[PDB]
Amino acid sequence: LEKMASIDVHLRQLVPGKVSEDDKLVEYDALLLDRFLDILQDLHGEDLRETVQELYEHSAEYEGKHEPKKLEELGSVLTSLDPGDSIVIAKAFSHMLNLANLAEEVQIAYRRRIKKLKKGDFVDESSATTESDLEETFKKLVGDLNKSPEEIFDALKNQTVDLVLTAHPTQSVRRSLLQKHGRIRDCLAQLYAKDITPDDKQELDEALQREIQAAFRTDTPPTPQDEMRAGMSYFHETIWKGVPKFLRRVDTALKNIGIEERVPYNAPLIQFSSWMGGDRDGNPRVTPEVTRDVCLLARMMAATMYFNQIEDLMFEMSMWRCNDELRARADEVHANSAKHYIEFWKSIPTTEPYRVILGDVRDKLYHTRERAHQLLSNGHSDVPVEATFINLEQFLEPLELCYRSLCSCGDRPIADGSLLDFLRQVSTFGLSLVRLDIRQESDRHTDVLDAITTHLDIGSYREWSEERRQEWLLSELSGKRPLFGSDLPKTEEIADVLDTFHVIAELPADSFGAYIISMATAPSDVLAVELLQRECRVKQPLRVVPLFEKLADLEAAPAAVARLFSVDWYKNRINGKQEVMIGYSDSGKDAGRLSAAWQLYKAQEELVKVAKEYGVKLTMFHGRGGTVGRGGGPTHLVILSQPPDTINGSLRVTVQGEVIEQSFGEEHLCFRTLQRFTAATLEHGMRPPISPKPEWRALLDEMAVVATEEYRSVVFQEPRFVEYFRLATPELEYGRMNIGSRPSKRKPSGGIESLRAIPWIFAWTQTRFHLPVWLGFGSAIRHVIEKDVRNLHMLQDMYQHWPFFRVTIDLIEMVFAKGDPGIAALYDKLLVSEELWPFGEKLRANFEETKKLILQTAGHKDLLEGDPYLKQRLRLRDSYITTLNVCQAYTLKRIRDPSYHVTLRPHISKEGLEDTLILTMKGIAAGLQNTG
Amino acid sequence: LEKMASIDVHLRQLVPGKVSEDDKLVEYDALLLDRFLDILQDLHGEDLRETVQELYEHSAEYEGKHEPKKLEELGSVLTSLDPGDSIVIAKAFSHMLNLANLAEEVQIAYRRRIKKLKKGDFVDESSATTESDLEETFKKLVGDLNKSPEEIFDALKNQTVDLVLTAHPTQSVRRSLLQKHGRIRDCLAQLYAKDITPDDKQELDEALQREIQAAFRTDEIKRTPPTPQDEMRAGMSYFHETIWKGVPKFLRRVDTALKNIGIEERVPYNAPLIQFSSWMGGDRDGNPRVTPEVTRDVCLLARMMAATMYFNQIEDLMFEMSMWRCNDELRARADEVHANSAKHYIEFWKSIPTTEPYRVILGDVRDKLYHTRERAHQLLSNGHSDVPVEATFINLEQFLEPLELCYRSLCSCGDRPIADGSLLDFLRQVSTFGLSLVRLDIRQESDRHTDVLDAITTHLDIGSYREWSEERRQEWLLSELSGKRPLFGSDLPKTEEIADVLDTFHVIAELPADSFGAYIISMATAPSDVLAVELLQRECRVKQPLRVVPLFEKLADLEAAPAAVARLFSVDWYKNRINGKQEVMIGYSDSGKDAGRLSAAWQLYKAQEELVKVAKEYGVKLTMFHGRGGTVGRGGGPTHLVILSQPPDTINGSLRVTVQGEVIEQSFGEEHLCFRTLQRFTAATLEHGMRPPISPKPEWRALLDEMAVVATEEYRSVVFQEPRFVEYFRLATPELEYGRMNIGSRPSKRKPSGGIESLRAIPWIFAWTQTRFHLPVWLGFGSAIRHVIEKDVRNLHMLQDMYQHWPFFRVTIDLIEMVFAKGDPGIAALYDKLLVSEELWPFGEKLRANFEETKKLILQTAGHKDLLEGDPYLKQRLRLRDSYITTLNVCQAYTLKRIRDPSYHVTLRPHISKGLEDTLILTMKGIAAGLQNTG
Numbered sequence A: 001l002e003k004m005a006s007i008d009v010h011l012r013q014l015v016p017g018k019v020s021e022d023d024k025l026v027e028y029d030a031l032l033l034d035r036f037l038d039i040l041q042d043l044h045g046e047d048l049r050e051t052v053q054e055l056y057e058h059s060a061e062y063e064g065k066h067e068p069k070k071l072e073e074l075g076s077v078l079t080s081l082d083p084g085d086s087i088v089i090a091k092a093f094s095h096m097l098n099l100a101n102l103a104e105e106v107q108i109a110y111r112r113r114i115k116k117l118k119k120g121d122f123v124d125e126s127s128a129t130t131e132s133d134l135e136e137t138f139k140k141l142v143g144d145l146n147k148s149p150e151e152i153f154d155a156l157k158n159q160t161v162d163l164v165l166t167a168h169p170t171q172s173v174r175r176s177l178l179q180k181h182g183r184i185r186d187c188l189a190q191l192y193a194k195d196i197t198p199d200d201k202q203e204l205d206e207a208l209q210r211e212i213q214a215a216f217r218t219d220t221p222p223t224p225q226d227e228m229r230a231g232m233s234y235f236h237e238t239i240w241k242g243v244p245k246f247l248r249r250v251d252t253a254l255k256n257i258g259i260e261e262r263v264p265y266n267a268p269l270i271q272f273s274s275w276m277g278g279d280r281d282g283n284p285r286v287t288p289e290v291t292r293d294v295c296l297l298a299r300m301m302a303a304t305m306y307f308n309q310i311e312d313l314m315f316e317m318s319m320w321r322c323n324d325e326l327r328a329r330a331d332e333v334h335a336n337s338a339k340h341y342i343e344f345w346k347s348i349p350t351t352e353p354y355r356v357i358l359g360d361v362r363d364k365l366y367h368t369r370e371r372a373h374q375l376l377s378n379g380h381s382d383v384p385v386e387a388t389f390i391n392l393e394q395f396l397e398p399l400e401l402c403y404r405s406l407c408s409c410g411d412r413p414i415a416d417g418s419l420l421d422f423l424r425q426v427s428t429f430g431l432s433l434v435r436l437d438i439r440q441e442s443d444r445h446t447d448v449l450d451a452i453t454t455h456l457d458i459g460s461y462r463e464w465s466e467e468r469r470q471e472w473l474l475s476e477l478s479g480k481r482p483l484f485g486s487d488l489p490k491t492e493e494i495a496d497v498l499d500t501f502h503v504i505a506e507l508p509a510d511s512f513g514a515y516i517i518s519m520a521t522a523p524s525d526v527l528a529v530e531l532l533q534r535e536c537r538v539k540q541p542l543r544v545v546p547l548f549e550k551l552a553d554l555e556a557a558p559a560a561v562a563r564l565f566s567v568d569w570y571k572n573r574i575n576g577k578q579e580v581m582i583g584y585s586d587s588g589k590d591a592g593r594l595s596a597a598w599q600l601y602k603a604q605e606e607l608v609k610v611a612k613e614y615g616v617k618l619t620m621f622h623g624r625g626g627t628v629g630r631g632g633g634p635t636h637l638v639i640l641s642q643p644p645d646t647i648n649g650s651l652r653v654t655v656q657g658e659v660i661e662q663s664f665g666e667e668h669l670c671f672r673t674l675q676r677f678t679a680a681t682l683e684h685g686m687r688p689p690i691s692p693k694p695e696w697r698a699l700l701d702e703m704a705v706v707a708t709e710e711y712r713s714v715v716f717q718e719p720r721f722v723e724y725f726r727l728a729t730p731e732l733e734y735g736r737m738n739i740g741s742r743p744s745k746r747k748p749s750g751g752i753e754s755l756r757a758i759p760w761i762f763a764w765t766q767t768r769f770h771l772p773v774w775l776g777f778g779s780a781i782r783h784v785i786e787k788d789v790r791n792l793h794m795l796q797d798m799y800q801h802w803p804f805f806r807v808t809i810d811l812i813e814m815v816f817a818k819g820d821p822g823i824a825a826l827y828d829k830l831l832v833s834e835e836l837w838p839f840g841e842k843l844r845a846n847f848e849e850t851k852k853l854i855l856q857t858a859g860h861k862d863l864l865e866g867d868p869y870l871k872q873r874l875r876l877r878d879s880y881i882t883t884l885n886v887c888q889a890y891t892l893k894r895i896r897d898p899s900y901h902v903t904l905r906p907h908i909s910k911e912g913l914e915d916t917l918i919l920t921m922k923g924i925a926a927g928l929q930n931t932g
Numbered sequence B: 001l002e003k004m005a006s007i008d009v010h011l012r013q014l015v016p017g018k019v020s021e022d023d024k025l026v027e028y029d030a031l032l033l034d035r036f037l038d039i040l041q042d043l044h045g046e047d048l049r050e051t052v053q054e055l056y057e058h059s060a061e062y063e064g065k066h067e068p069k070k071l072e073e074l075g076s077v078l079t080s081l082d083p084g085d086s087i088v089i090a091k092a093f094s095h096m097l098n099l100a101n102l103a104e105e106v107q108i109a110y111r112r113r114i115k116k117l118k119k120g121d122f123v124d125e126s127s128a129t130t131e132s133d134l135e136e137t138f139k140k141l142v143g144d145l146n147k148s149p150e151e152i153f154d155a156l157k158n159q160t161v162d163l164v165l166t167a168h169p170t171q172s173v174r175r176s177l178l179q180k181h182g183r184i185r186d187c188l189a190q191l192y193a194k195d196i197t198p199d200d201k202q203e204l205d206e207a208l209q210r211e212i213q214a215a216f217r218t219d220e221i222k223r224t225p226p227t228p229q230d231e232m233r234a235g236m237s238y239f240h241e242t243i244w245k246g247v248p249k250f251l252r253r254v255d256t257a258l259k260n261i262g263i264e265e266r267v268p269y270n271a272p273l274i275q276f277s278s279w280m281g282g283d284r285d286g287n288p289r290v291t292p293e294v295t296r297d298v299c300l301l302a303r304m305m306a307a308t309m310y311f312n313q314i315e316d317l318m319f320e321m322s323m324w325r326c327n328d329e330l331r332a333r334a335d336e337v338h339a340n341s342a343k344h345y346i347e348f349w350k351s352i353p354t355t356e357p358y359r360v361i362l363g364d365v366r367d368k369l370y371h372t373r374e375r376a377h378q379l380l381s382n383g384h385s386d387v388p389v390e391a392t393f394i395n396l397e398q399f400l401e402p403l404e405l406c407y408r409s410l411c412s413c414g415d416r417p418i419a420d421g422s423l424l425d426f427l428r429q430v431s432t433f434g435l436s437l438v439r440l441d442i443r444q445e446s447d448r449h450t451d452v453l454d455a456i457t458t459h460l461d462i463g464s465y466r467e468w469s470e471e472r473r474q475e476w477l478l479s480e481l482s483g484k485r486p487l488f489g490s491d492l493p494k495t496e497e498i499a500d501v502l503d504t505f506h507v508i509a510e511l512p513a514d515s516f517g518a519y520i521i522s523m524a525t526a527p528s529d530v531l532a533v534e535l536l537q538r539e540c541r542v543k544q545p546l547r548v549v550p551l552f553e554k555l556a557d558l559e560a561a562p563a564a565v566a567r568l569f570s571v572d573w574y575k576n577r578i579n580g581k582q583e584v585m586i587g588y589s590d591s592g593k594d595a596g597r598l599s600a601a602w603q604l605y606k607a608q609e610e611l612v613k614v615a616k617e618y619g620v621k622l623t624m625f626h627g628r629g630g631t632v633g634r635g636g637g638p639t640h641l642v643i644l645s646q647p648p649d650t651i652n653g654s655l656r657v658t659v660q661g662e663v664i665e666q667s668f669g670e671e672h673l674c675f676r677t678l679q680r681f682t683a684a685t686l687e688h689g690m691r692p693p694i695s696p697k698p699e700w701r702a703l704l705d706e707m708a709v710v711a712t713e714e715y716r717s718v719v720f721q722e723p724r725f726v727e728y729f730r731l732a733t734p735e736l737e738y739g740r741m742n743i744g745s746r747p748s749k750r751k752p753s754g755g756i757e758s759l760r761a762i763p764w765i766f767a768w769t770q771t772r773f774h775l776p777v778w779l780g781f782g783s784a785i786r787h788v789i790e791k792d793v794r795n796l797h798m799l800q801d802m803y804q805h806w807p808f809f810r811v812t813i814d815l816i817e818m819v820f821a822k823g824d825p826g827i828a829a830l831y832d833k834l835l836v837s838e839e840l841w842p843f844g845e846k847l848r849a850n851f852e853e854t855k856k857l858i859l860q861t862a863g864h865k866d867l868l869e870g871d872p873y874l875k876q877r878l879r880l881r882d883s884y885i886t887t888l889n890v891c892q893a894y895t896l897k898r899i900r901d902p903s904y905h906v907t908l909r910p911h912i913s914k915g916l917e918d919t920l921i922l923t924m925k926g927i928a929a930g931l932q933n934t935g
């Protein structure tokens, strides 16, 4: 059984050097692959294992030298498989790739940092191995920026990082498999403890095989409640315990620069928001009942976690010396009816006052859970609302009383233990863990107000000009008469909108965040949501957040927001705070990526100018994809790259589902995520990036013109482009496939304009081509190099000295690292008409030229020259991904073309090609993670 | 703040050398003591901290050279304290001693073993650093005895270790304080990781200080002398702490060790290698607070604790059990369960689909567990329920069946590795803990049964069962058990005690057999006592009667015991009722209180010999239950040799031992300590079953018989013949204050009037353990060894041969020597000076001289010049503890003088920073926690 020696040789040939000396990635992945292949031999036979290992070896040789002969060598094997063998092989490479990710995570979490590797500039913030931790950021602020420790502390006090969980564009990984990945990571890490005993190591090996098999032997498009349940798992996994540890580390770093206070436990440095069950944009499956469900489910998970956390808190709080105030409350609580701690104590006596009060809190938490459960499964309760906590103050008040009393009695250290962590958990997570944003297209609000005005015999709000719409909406917001009643013809859509508002109205305000308007263009959209909110009797209306998607919408955004701030009603409703959302993926679908990047920098600049004008605190909400959508260290520089004063201590970022596991799956990875978001926000508030030189802005304006020209000329002007897109890519199968929880085309008939951003990026990411990400950069850089000899030098200056530019270029280079034109050529050869075959050749030439020009700008000879660790990990995944690519291509040809008969091979073991296609989609998706 | 330099100096003088090179004990206790003393300065002032530190330094100097001046300097400070400062200093030294204990536990748990330190004989089995682990025991059985691994495996399959939790004789430490100690041990251990980062180390320091303060600021006196339900709750803490998770880890290590000798099977998941029993809520012997309701309560409470733990564990089990390939049998069960109403996993899944059959079955089991928990809670809190009994698990088989279905099903499809994961741990936990975690034994005096039957026969006009001879008692009992007519009804004059007995039986009949073990008869002397319990059981309608276990306490009861047990096996009814299994109990503390220690030890070896002879004669499998104190009563490594020391064939794969409350924290408080405890019980049981100790040479037997005669003569001549002994015991010792003080949950004097004879064994041992004198343990040995050395010059050599080559003798002597390490005649003399009349002073002086003589003689026997010459690790830890205990000794002595004598006015000192009874209780609890086990 000498197969391990060969896979060892191929892994060492794929990743030759050591990116450090704790570089155990090759060792880790070799171990996981040996154990997996032994299990595979045991379950589906020797023949299956030999076939699989032959496929992987060819894949590694290809990712070695990129010989096109290797790809046909893979294909000859993969097409001769009957659907059963195809499914077993595809499943196998999916789990192998997953194991590579798990090993990769262990490497990242236990890679020792290097102090001597820091260069001293902003480039260090692009990798976790050199980025500034919390305290290095403090000493950067104190030494270089001449900020006082008091100023840093006060900034932290008023800072908020708000992380928004969004639905996975594909497989939102089930909670059970998250747990299994956790056990696998734990077993790996412990197996490499330089102190492990022989028996412990054997039992760890046996647990590792056991877990790999457990994950490999498990097989609707999950209901939005199920996907939400799955998306919330990271709170149980790492975030709940991780948050108080991080805040405590903030306290320590403050003590180490002379600050004697701790960060106030009620200061919302960390907040969590969710779109799961709230985003309705082109998703009729997200109903009012779905939103109510995920709201109550969230309140349930929160009550459970607080309930379970408060018993160990009750065990710790056994003191007797206390406040006069606390003693009064304890004697008060002692006057009542003790069912949830009989296993611990028959009853809580009055000489343990903290235990009395805390026991009453535990009882109210129990009634809170049971009521939320009763509302969820029925629609009414009988549990008195006064016997529960309804707002955060009812909850915080007795805990704060305990804290005051303990400090009163010289027991402050005890208070800074389980109690401080608990208080910080209540402040971070509230009664819901997350606050749900609601998202809907503006057009639906136009439809509702149009049915309303037509019903009042005043005309059609839709035909009205923007100014007339604003004037009517303003006259209604300032009036006292209601707008409509039950007597109102509602279409299914109009009734959905109003019913969603009624459900928001009947639920606690702690569950909701922002009302997000998709395709927002004008102030009347924002006023429409505010009016519909008020007239549906929502007592505390949500803050309305416009989403400006298209490029023209971005240009018109600061005028519309200034006009909104200028009207007295909206100015008194917002009370000096406004949140605006900009969409990177969406805008890229409109006008290419380079143009969306520069337009979003300028648009944020102008929005900040308006916000300073009217005295409003602006919060920029960064949607999905983009430069702000990356994993790990790059994000630190991403945040540092935003224009000066666009953050100002209030950051709101989408954590894309395709990165959320790499970011919160493990204890260390999670802690470092929270650390870098907080540190980059704090530093940016006190140390903005440089203002761009005037020639830099002129150069980017021209490049923006050329890049949007090329992008629209290929994507939108070419007549046969849509046919090519439907052939050289699995877009049709992705939409038909019940994969994306929502549908792809907003209007089923329409073109790419109506195609959503997620399938737009996905379709080209599956083929390792990524055209929506890089297209346009080529002609823009060619144009400026040819127009003036010196512009290359200017470009190289920007990449070296302008953070915004460096992060934009860095993203293009990274996406090219995940690209391989040869595989794309295979897709062309199998799936595209001969009439249309030369077209892909031209686009591929553009791919190569764009790659060379990006290298020239970054001063690099190879891709990712500055981040060898990431190059290593990506090169590792590519060996598995390439196999899922070839399998997906031939499977597509077999699905579309029943006239393509293959010489099948005999069944292998196990002692429908649609399923295999879905496997390859999920696999390739999991191996490429984030692109644009 | 250079105070740290002084406490470091004193600590290094107390423990000078290194018992290894991972000896960080002095570092550990120095760090903890520094942090504690800083907290003490911050809360109660600088003067309080300086006074306390001056006291501790003097205490350590005393435990160094035993200079009598140091004791008067301690007393001089301690008498001048007004009651407030007395409370603060006593509390302070209690928590400091606890920290010495915690540092000691960390040192023991992380001390690396040394393979080169093994000598190759049985002496190695007396210390954790050299004892044989499971695999070393296997290879010792295979190499030296040429046993096949299959024989070892079959022995393990049929071996059972049965550990019985009994009430702590004093402060059964509250669950909360156990948890704080856990956090402190973890901060220490993590603070010394040789790779730890600066911020982590700073935050661990902050957590350590925080936790030490948390423990110091909780009261440990007020409320009630905890109700038996509360004491049971506190006693059950070790299942949540370590035992629940600990059982499957140990069994898996057993599997690995079996693999390393060629055995490919695992220990069958239903095989009872480990069992737990409880007396908490069942022992009524001289304890009227333990009522029938108490028994019903602890049974149902235990059933709740078990259902809770299974409920929480089966959710992770449900996450692991996500397979789809399954058995035809399991697939059928999944389709059936799917036909029903799904309320306990909405946060996880809306409902369980049929393509996850293991999740279907496990979810339905989880539902049944929730109904069981809430139902038992309803029975406890009311008296009835409404939860249908068919919607719960009433016996262990309903519970085990679907889990075995999952295991069989998983193995059918080549998923055996998956089954040997979360599921195997679960099956072994169900088999070990059952539906109750523990089985409650009931214990009652035989005399109470005599009272019940006497009221019965008097009510029927046949005579008084009490006046009847033993043979007539037997004849009547035998005529009644074989008959078809009931014995009594409601029309029966019952005294309060008789009603207690009958209600106890009625409660036993109304509860599941899964909750009960053995009915143990205290002061058992004759077969009529056992037949009385069997009859009262049958006539009180207990459907599945408990197995009856006589407790032979007094020496004469032990001598007559094999005759009585033989007579019991010879009666056809009892023979067919017991079905070939019998458990008999012997009591080490009881026998020592009767006849001294040496005679009770030798008498118990012979008594076990004779009981085995009877069991082999009649073909019955005998189980010896070892009560509290004794040679079988120690902490840690010594138990390994203790078990190996029992007479051949007395164990035979079924061991039942009392785990005394004063040691249970040292044995089950920490992960490693727990694993090694289970390991040494299992390994010692297996080895004794296959490799008995040598049989004693005839001259060793004759010699021990002589020593038994002389030793009982001295012991009874001092305890029972000296008239003023009872007078002295009430002065030189806090026996009176222990009983009057609401300390021992039960009372001391059985009949309040009587002497030591009616005094229970626990207060008897305790009273003398507090004064560092330990008279009940060593008295009689002095004269015995003197007698045999004088009769023949050569007997010393014979004694020295026995200690070196006879395990029983070595463990007995080892125990006496260990108790002597914890003894100090100077402190006992201080108690004499403060509390004892002058005309009785020579009496104590004479007793102390016996103390000295026995000590020297014990040394001569063990071939040692210093105490504990062969176990420096134990000597080291004991020396460490004694420096703290001594201050609590002097304080307790002067506090006793202040309580008894209000005519003793002291020149008080001013109060320091922000009731002598509470002080006394503090000193008792502290000294008890530092001295732990003796005899």
Ligand SMILES: [Cl-]
Binding pocket: A624, A756, A757, A758
């Ligand atoms: Cl989107």
Ligand SMILES: [Cl-]
Binding pocket: A225, A293, B350
């Ligand atoms: Cl639901």
Ligand SMILES: [Cl-]
Binding pocket: B589, B628, B760, B761, B762
């Ligand atoms: Cl006893």
